[PDB]
Amino acid sequence: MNVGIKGFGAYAPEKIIDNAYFEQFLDTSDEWISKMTGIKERHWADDDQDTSDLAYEASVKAIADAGIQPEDIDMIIVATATGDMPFPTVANMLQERLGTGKVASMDQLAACSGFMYSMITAKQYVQSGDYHNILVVGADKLSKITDLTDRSTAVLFGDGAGAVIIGEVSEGRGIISYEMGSDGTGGKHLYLDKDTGKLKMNGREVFKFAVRIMGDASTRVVEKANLTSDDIDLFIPHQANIRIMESARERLGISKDKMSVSVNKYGNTSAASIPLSIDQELKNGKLKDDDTIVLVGFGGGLTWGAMTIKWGK
Amino acid sequence: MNVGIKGFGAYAPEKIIDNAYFEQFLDTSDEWISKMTGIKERHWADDDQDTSDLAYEASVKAIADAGIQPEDIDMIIVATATGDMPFPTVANMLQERLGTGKVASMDQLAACSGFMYSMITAKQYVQSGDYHNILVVGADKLSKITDLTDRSTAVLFGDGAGAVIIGEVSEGRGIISYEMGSDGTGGKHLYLDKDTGKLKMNGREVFKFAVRIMGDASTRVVEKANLTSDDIDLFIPHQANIRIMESARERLGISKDKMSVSVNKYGNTSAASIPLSIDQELKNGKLKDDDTIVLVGFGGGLTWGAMTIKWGK
């Protein structure tokens, strides 16, 4: 069976925060933040706009791009680490707000790698024959869990959502290959502090792990598709660090003009990261039907995923 | 392909809390709690025992019962609304403590219904031919989110975990039929209050939903499996309210001695509820190879699940 992306949409909130903003509360600079991360601005949800609101905005665009009606959706999976509540889930709230039938809806947690975990989950369902139009969202409001007193993390993170309908697509298109994994030995390097409610990171260890796993997962998922570097039209890594993305690109062996970079405008958006990058490449006319794209990400867990997708219905 | 339960384990923590315990800080009695719920006691985890510890103990029992090795597990899925942290996940921590390879691991939120959601998730992965031994955990520490100042809810909830290995089983065994649903319009009737971090319930609306869905959904999957009342060996609903369980039982037209009752010793334990009842029926010798069991449940979301399963590997 050919299972792919029948429609796509992405949303970042209105409020844009520049690097210079942090200088009034923290010992940081534009020059420091830019050099180290490649981030120039990030988007932050308003106080009354939660993860579910970002998810909603991305999903309605996905459904219009898919040319289906809400009643066509036969399951909702939201990848988020920052759901409004553990119950009801962002997935539940979208069932109500999108006005779908009373279909199965759940949040899946794999941090930064969640969007890829959920798309793969959706694929398994569609391949059974029982599901035709599965809404997969990657949404994080990371601004809720950012320690604004820590210069090392306060500057990293922003908010957004992406969404795809996973269903049947035409011959040769869709999800060709995927790789998922985890390594709980790295949990202590990137976690949500149980007391403060804030993201805690051993940056140097996350860096070293990100460089290796991003390199490994992307080359492996290309080999599994029986493709080489030369067959890839776009490399779309999870957007967190320009150095990490560069290192992964070098391992894979593809040219810089072939790597999607949106970290400069969104910072890191966890599950929303890859979709916000895809949105940029669609609108700039760098991604079209029949292009072969490689996604890769790592996350707190530690988690990782990678997929080879041929673009189009 | 026949996909079912290769191995089963369950775990309730040591500390038993009787109905009389509540009298020292609430206006409750044994008879008041017993007439309302059918609850006599519940198990609460120690302060140094989180959802992952409960999940770990159910999982090792599940592995030994499956007669496999940790290196055989190709995916960990944990159904929980009370994971230690959103990242790393309970699934991530199990990847490490169980000593598995670096396999896909994720937590799935469908509240109360999560265990049923996640076994169905596991089934989709096995039916593809790429996964053979998927660990599925239903684990909640509801003690952590119980409002001990609200007599209505303080007495309802306890802690536990169940675990199955989902994989190939012999001719005619395993998951025969299922249904999974959600209705986000009921989100306001059962949720985690953002401010307190505690479960808030409109009891009337929840009871009305429970009664209707637990009868509609069990009946539908019995029908969907081309079976009737007499084919059912065990009815194992989510254990929470004995008047709600009896309502589902008589709507199925089934003998009292055919329903599993464990709410008397565990209270409601969310994703752990059905597995803790299965374990009691196993050790009491009420559940055997080729027995046809019916599962049904609802959760905050709202969510629901129902399945027909023929026992054994």
Ligand SMILES: *C(=O)N(CNC(=O)c1ccc(Cl)cc1)CC1CC1
């Ligand atoms: C993703 O899993 N994630 C957010 N990203 C990071 O914490 C991160 C990105 C890049 C570097 Cl160098 C370090 C850390 C953490 C939890 C989902 C929120």
Ligand SMILES: *C(=O)N(CNC(=O)c1ccc(Cl)cc1)CC1CC1
């Ligand atoms: C299940 O979703 N769950 C456990 N909680 C209940 O609120 C409940 C069960 C049964 C009855 Cl009759 C009433 C209430 C709620 C959230 C996952 C923890």
